[PDB]
Symmetry: C4
Subunit: 243 residues, 4 copies
Amino acid sequence: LRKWPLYRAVIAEFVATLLFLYVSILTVIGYKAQTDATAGGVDCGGVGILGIAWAFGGMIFVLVYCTAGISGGHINPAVTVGLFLARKVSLVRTVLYIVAQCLGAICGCGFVKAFQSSYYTRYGGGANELADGYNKGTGLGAEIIGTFVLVYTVFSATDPKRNARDSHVPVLAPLPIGFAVFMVHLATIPITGTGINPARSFGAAVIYNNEKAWDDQWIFWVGPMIGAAAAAFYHQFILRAAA
Amino acid sequence: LRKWPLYRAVIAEFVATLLFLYVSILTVIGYKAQTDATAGGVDCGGVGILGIAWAFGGMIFVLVYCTAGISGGHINPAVTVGLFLARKVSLVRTVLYIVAQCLGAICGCGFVKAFQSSYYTRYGGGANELADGYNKGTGLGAEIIGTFVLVYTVFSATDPKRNARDSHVPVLAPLPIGFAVFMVHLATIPITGTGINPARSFGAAVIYNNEKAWDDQWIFWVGPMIGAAAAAFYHQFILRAAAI
Amino acid sequence: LRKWPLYRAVIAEFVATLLFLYVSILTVIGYKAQTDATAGGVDCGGVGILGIAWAFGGMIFVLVYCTAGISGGHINPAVTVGLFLARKVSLVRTVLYIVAQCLGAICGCGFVKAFQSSYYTRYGGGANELADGYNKGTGLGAEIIGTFVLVYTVFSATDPKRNARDSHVPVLAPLPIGFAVFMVHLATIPITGTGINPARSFGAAVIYNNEKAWDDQWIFWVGPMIGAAAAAFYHQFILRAAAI
Amino acid sequence: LRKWPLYRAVIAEFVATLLFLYVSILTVIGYKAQTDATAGGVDCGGVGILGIAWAFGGMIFVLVYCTAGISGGHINPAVTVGLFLARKVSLVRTVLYIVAQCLGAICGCGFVKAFQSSYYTRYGGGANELADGYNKGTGLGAEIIGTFVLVYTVFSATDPKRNARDSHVPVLAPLPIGFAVFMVHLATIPITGTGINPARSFGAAVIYNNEKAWDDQWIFWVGPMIGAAAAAFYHQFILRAAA
């Protein structure tokens, strides 16, 4: 049937997101646990904020590869919308994929508190937030262009020759995507902590649960979607890679 | 002959694990010796703990690439045992790898301290234990998922067609598997130093031998197996990508 | 139509360079803002200057991968000009890229300071200049070889068969080229911040505009060209791997 | 003719070695220039000794790829001997390849002094040396096993299907080799600064020119060759990958 594999192709998206978050989170939180804030431990010496940026782009690359020929290796709500606005994701999928992504991200970040809870709460919760020093418009713009780069990669990465089984869904070359994320994280983590993935953003937000988080949560949906839409427009028409 | 190509690989495992544990732990002890205790050493200016995580990751990347069409690139009881529940490595072929790998680790581990026994001993010796602040359940829960992440990555990394020499043992591109190892560490080192490898943990426990360390060791066997047995279960049925 | 697939790529260059300069410099300024001046910031605990070098490297890796079968993945006047002496990019097709790339950089550069004009200005703005202690000849000699390393890497990275859309423009795997960019930086950043990209340097010089910076800028054009013209010469004849 | 391409296949080995060294060197020296010794600059903050290890394994990977289908992508005297002892390098080549490698390495490190000369001399010269704290036997053993890993990769990396033009010389998969180097550098740089490449070792030695360097230069030829020989024995016979 069509309903059973679609369901299974969605089950993957949920699982991979769960893994992706908590690794990236417990990397961030593990970093923030080893690297001291004010006092009570060692300054620096952690994985560096280079190590954190490795966690995201690295876990993504792995999972995209793990979830390539199944779901399509989407793992990102912004990416899902891009591919959808590219008229190549069967509507109902995206609605489910977002539920899939946003579910597991809550789960993932949830498994992190359970482990520590102590050093979790004090240390950021791994939740995306505006860094003090920048205006909101600045932060919004970075998320837009940032996500744009990620999504621009995806479409370029789609090989028409190779496709997912029991579907017309584009399988993705797993490496440059995860590397594109890593580049963006290197560029962004100061400003916002790098959202460009509403699943992640909404994920830790539910768990960490802070006024400043919820107040600034509105960006990492708007910003990314704007970019993913722009990247779709940039790829399928003004580069016209459709034909 | 079945024995000559089998032992061909049963050794290749042992060697890789020897090489694996050697390069990795020699980095860790190196990192320790760079920052060290008050009087001697400078902080931060080592490889960074990221660099340690690199060592464990990339070594898996190359040793699998070398032992791909030979042993199948396990270098891990969990990965091997995981491929047994998956009914892809016949019983007797597993138990050998299980033992063959463990010895290499020890041989790899013991080789390291002979270089730096003075330093080695004072600085944790790359032994898998709980960092204080974490309840034992936290440490256990960390290993199972971390192993799962890898073993699942290992399974999605199974070519349906190509075999290692003279068996039904998988052969596929390793680069993701190395990252899975590398990734997990970055998030798991703060807790246990990242085990997700029963032989590696066992090999560290044998040489170092510290009671509080040695009686926590049970976790890094109990844990990883479950995470592997789950990933095998999930990938083979809950995804059922094996059905054809 | 010749114009529609040409401009198809003439834009793709411009955009990549815009994206390139944006992501890279936003990291640098980020690094600056993390350590900063006495009162504000913590040292070391940034990405590390290695992380900066990563940004320049990997961005070349992905933007070439995106613009491989489109523009041919130059994102660099030197690389483009280098492929002109190699007689592989017809005259008029180069001059466009030469200009098309430069604008993107500026557009990419200008976009960055609009985010952080306060910080940006106080912290070097990713502008290519000589760090004190180096004579100007040292800085020049650094850029030429660094560019050579890349442009030579670019040439050894030329598939004899596959073209970009509707031209005779090469298409081959990018991963080495990204590393060449990444590698050179690690050894060249201490001197100039690593130029090896005339458009990038020009783009940085336009927005930042500082006289002592702006009148040293001539180096990062004079240099890279020579290193590119050499690599093209060496690869095409001294190795003569192009002859068939 | 046979003499012209052989000569050209040797010209590549020289060039790539020149590049490899000075980049790795000026990375090491650039690191040591930015990172202070006792006083006169900033502590840490450099590329880290992770960044240095990236320079070696990274430059190698690039150049091996750049010099694959030509020379065979050898770049290392130890590797040359291994492939030779594997009965698959036409004797005369190795003698020339060593001259090729050891020449450019001197050149490379030479271009570094010219640039700085000031901060060159005080800061190690990028020359391999025993780290104070270890015995010589310890240091020798690391170079042996270290080089072994590098060379074991090479043979495993040799694809019999693909071969260099106008030769029977094995082209190498450029990535795992350069990555194997990187791993070893991460493991070794404390102890010796990682030799496993007599070209590099003899390269900076000529330029830096120190008593302690020349005294301890004897290791990074003996050690590596022992390993490269062992890796050859480990590969071609007790793994018997010859047939």
